[PDB]
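User: Need the bound-state model for zinc ion:
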Amino acid sequence: VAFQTVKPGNFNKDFYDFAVSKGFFKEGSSVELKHFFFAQDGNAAISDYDYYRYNLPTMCDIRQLLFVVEVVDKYFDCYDGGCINANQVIVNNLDKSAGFPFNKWGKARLYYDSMSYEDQDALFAYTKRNVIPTITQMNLKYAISAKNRARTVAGVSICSTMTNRQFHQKLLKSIAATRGATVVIGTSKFYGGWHNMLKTVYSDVENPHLMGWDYPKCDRAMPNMLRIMASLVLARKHTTCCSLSHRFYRLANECAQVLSEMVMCGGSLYVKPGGTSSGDATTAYANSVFNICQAVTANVNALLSTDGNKIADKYVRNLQHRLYECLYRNRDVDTDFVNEFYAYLRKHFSMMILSDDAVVCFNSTYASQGLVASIKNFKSVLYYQNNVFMSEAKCWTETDLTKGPHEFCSQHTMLVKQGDDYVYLPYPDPSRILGAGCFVDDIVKTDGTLMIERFVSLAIDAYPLTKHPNQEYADVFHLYLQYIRKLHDELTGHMLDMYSVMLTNNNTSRYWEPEFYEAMYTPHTVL
Amino acid sequence: VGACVLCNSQTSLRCGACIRRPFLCCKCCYDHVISTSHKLVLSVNPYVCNAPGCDVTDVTQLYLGGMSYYCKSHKPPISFPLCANGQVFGLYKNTCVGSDNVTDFNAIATCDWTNAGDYILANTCTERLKLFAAETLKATEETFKLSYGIATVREVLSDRELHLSWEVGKPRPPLNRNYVFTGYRVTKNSKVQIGEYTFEKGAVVYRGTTTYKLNVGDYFVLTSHTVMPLSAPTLVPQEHYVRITGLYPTLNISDEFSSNVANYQKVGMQKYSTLQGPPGTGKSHFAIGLALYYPSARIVYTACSHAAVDALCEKALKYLPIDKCSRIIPAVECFDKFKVNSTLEQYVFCTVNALPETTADIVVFDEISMATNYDLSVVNARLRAKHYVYIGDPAQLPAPRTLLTKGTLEPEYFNSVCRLMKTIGPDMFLGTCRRCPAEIVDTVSALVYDNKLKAHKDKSAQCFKMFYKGVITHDVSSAINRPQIGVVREFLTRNPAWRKAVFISPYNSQNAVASKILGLPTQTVDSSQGSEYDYVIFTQTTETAHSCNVNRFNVAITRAKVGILCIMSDRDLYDKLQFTSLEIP
Amino acid sequence: FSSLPSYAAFATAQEAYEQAVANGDSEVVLKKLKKSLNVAKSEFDRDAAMQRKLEKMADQAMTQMYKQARSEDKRAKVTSAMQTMLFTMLRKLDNDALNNIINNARDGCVPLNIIPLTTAAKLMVVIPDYNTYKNTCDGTTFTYASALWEIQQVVDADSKIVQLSEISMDNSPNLAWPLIVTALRAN
Amino acid sequence: FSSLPSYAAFATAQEAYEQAVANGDSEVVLKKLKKSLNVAKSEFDRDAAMQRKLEKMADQAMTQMYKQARSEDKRAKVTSAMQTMLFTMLRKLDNDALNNIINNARDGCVPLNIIPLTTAAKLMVVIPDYNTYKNTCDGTTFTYASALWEIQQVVDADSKIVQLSEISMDNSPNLAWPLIVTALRA
Amino acid sequence: KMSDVKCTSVVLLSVLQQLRVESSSKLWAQCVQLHNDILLAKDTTEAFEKMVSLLSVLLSMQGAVDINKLCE
RNA sequence: GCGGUAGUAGCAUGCUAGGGAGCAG
RNA sequence: AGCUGCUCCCUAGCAUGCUACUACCG
Ligand SMILES: [Zn+2]
Ligand SMILES: [Zn+2]
Ligand SMILES: [Zn+2]
Ligand SMILES: [Zn+2]
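Assistant: Bound-state model below.
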């Protein structure tokens, strides 16, 4: 057996000296180092693969899933999808690994190269009548973090993603190129996109109250039934391009490749019990389907389980009665009532989704009477369906909408004045910015002159702190500016000492002035 | 990426076709390429046309299109001729001085190391270029050594005798220990671990180091190593001090070191000091003296071979306290009376090729003659010694140059320290020859010693010379003088006490025939140093410059400490030799 | 572009122009030789301009077909490597026990998770601590998967050989302790 | 860029145009100086264009090759800058506990195991001479890592346990000096 | 002051790792454990005892010549 | 005097490709 | 040694488009 360790990140001392020169890192200050490069001992990989013991064979309430799936389906009727030919797939970064055992010969470029545009289609039409088991490799990530737990990511073999791309890519790239929907994958936070998103989810609810969450170990606590349902909801759009046997055999291939595939962790094969493998083609959208399913299930449970003799609004009581009727006393889909319930939800439960990181704006004078999901209902649902206890130290709830979500995608939201009106911007955790400045991987920094662009990007991400009331926050951006200035006017002098002419023209002065950076947070798109 | 050899200005062009690929100063690089056959240059990326299926390596035709380098028929419309302004594009082009005269470097780099003029150019030039020349000659001879055929053994005749075949199309190296082979045992997987051997005519005779059983299929090669770029100069700057620097003078004196201490203050009075060390004058005892003349000094015993440090180790087991000695041998059998691989020790005994990088109170460099400019500067790289002593003599055997073909290289031009020994003179001198009698010391003194060596005890009248003609017959790597082989037995019969004398020979295969006729032991002239015998005999065999030039004979004649036998077939030194001439039988 | 049939025409037109300019005969001569240079430029224009795009087109086509040929060659090497790896790894498995258990199936198809369990000729154990070692790999023989194995070549994390007498209770904290105990199938 | 050959032609054409406009002589004669001056800036701006491009492209290529050289030599020397920066930070730290053990290890007292932190557990310290013993050990108390330890078992180099009281300046040249001393935390 | 301890623990672990200390699993496990506790510490005094324990590991071997490296 | 066409240079926008880097799940 | 999404920087190309200068014809 082979034991793989995780090394510690290196130190960029010069930036630390500059930071302490400017009166930083003094005891009792708000900004402080918390994001470090942790190290791991020999048996780190297997001690993280062992976390799949939190996966238990679970039964689902079928007569309720057969309705939650209808509503989640209706949430996805705005887009389009279908099978695409070999000459239309779009693939970025063709020099990534090709999984096991293909990584012994070359990267993905070789295998995406040797197949002519007819071999790939022959394979993709072969898999619609056959099953191809594969072997997944398991690798650790090497990145800054605030917790000492390792992170393990699955490198799936090329024969899986090569066909999954063709099967799913039309719908995947139709989801990522739509604005104003529930899923917000692909919408950028620059040039006033974050403000648009936040004003989207506030749409028309009456007495709003924010609510968010995130799932503890989402990929490993996933039951198999919800993975299957998510894949079915994704593959539903192929009503015309494929037959019914073809769709079933493609689903069987998906279950054989991302649900119980023989993970090759270390130097020996194991059996992955269940849950998603995070390194396949459609993780970031299967997670969205999961999240919407849990939201709908929480709403269903919260409305059904209410004493229906105290409800005063007649319409919601009739909604309760018809909901139970079509849930248990019925057998076939009733699209009239599915539309009715979806309208009720989108009018009294607004949502924003990325891959399991959600934000919900709900009417509050209903949730206080249990007509919509509160934050306890998600605890109950996760308990009896996901087999995890949702700690109330990970779910927040906000009531003053002038301040946005307490946290979304690891960015806080602040309402500043930008020109004449007021906008919302994402500002990161300052310690994250400083920890990215100081700890690096041996040449990627520790000599700033060689890179400079990384400091430019970090100052781009750290701009919104400049409007923060906390004084110890803006000095981070100002320090970054002065460091870029020092780096540039030291590189010029050093090159001049090694040569006899200085850079004839650069127009680099825009980099160490705020005017280049304040243009990335104004609503006029210069790509 | 470093500074160029001639100009020391930082640069990034490296001479491609050149042997060791030195860092080339940009315009200085243009001079090197235009004045030599070295037309290939490599920067951080190589200057070769990157368009597929190309061959051109000459820099001049290469033009710069975008982020790459292009020949004439491969460019895009936008170009930038790199070979422009007489200045090839390269790093630090303006922080460049160039060189007005580079033809010395041009001849050094275009040198095949054929004549003595090559070594004259190497020695007469300055620090950086002499170091480059030494490295190039070492690498070039190491390259030719493996260019010869393989020494395969196909039949096993008997003990110490084998039948050997050789590779076709490549020649055969000589038949002496001058180039020690190194075979490995071939198995189904690979070839490993036989050892270092010397082959001589017997049918061949192998002289292995350790006990071994050689079977068929085992073949021996002249193993080569990778010569690495030297840094330090051969000699540190000279500086004469005003007091004894860094050492505490001794309280009491020893009569055997009375003649040592008189020359010892000036050793510690200055950075480095040179020696006039004749054979058998106690130079090893001179080196031992510094340890007794300075008990707290951490001195390091260094020489070209472990057998030469063995001489220093020979006098270490007697006078030096064994509790403070350390012999360093890399992982060959030799003296190991000390503890091995101990850097942190007072007395350190190691060969110049294996002592780690330390600091020394005062160094002793035994046998400086055979240590060329390569190992002259090797020691300074390892140690920045506070004091320096050069134990050896330019009037002593140098290393045998396998590439020197025409012209005999001058004794002064061996290396830097031996060069100054003939111009400013040696700083020390030991006036007593502790082995040779008046018949030998007086004669060798008038030869190259400036009549500076004087007799020790007596004129034993036991050294004899003979006049003769002889007819030579030669073979692949030897030459045997038959009449002298007839004479040697003829001379020894009429006095049975003469059979205790060892036979010395220039071409050791000549004595191999003599050893069959008589049975007296064998001596090699090139390696007769360190070993001396009271009774020893010699045959001149040839009068060519290889054997009986003035200085390569001085070791053989000084082997005997009472009397020696040598039949002069020549007349260049027979007239000068003050020996006794008898009748030819 | 100098061997085109335009270099000669331009040269003769300019030679006439310069000869008559030195002569300086008439203004109509100047007009005629200006018209000659004003019509011989279009000759030169498309005779040394379009041909400077044909070269670029030919070169880019040549590079593209070079790249395609290299792609095909890489395909050939990887095909050979994969076929030889399959053919060298299949020769280690076809024991008569595998054939025996494949013949006894009702259909010839047997689950994958029983082939090593019932035909493997070597067992690897991984033990995290002495307590687990005592219950499973105790002594020089142990029974797993309803067979008999004999312990051989016990090794530690550093992959150095550890003899069986060392693994006591008190000596346990002095060993690297993902012990990998190997064994073979006994009959 | 003014040293280019065509600048002289441009200057001559400009001077001719200036003289003509200062004279205002004709209508077509100065048109010769618009069919020869506007032409004169056609072989100038085209010849002053690529050379300005060429200088910048040369500069950008040379600076990228410089950065490549710097990145190549910085990763070929990491395992001495690591240690030098380490010890510079350690000296800047100014902690007595580290200083004591660093001085001791510099003079010879290198512990042969991890220094334990609990009040239990054993420490094993080499003491290759007697002067080094004088400062650290005093009777039955061992002073190391700015802690207080209790000596229990000294041993010479040939693994022969020596009594504590025997060692002394007179009898110091009588034991195999690389002692190892077992002691426990206070 | 503690931030300096965290930084010096990082650089110390890097030099230890390039000294080839991970060839012996138990030693590397102890080192990584100590380094993780130093990085997650909230107060300065226990950081310093774990710091001296971690530095004793480097002092134990003979690979890092100390007298030269301490050049003041 | 106008328009058209053919060349040359410059500038802008955008689309594609290649390389480097950063952030979020 | 994974799947995405966003952003910054450098270069190359085609095409488009604009402007300026020259030549031919009407
Ligand atoms: Zn389809
Ligand atoms: Zn050269
Ligand atoms: Zn130069
Ligand atoms: Zn070419």
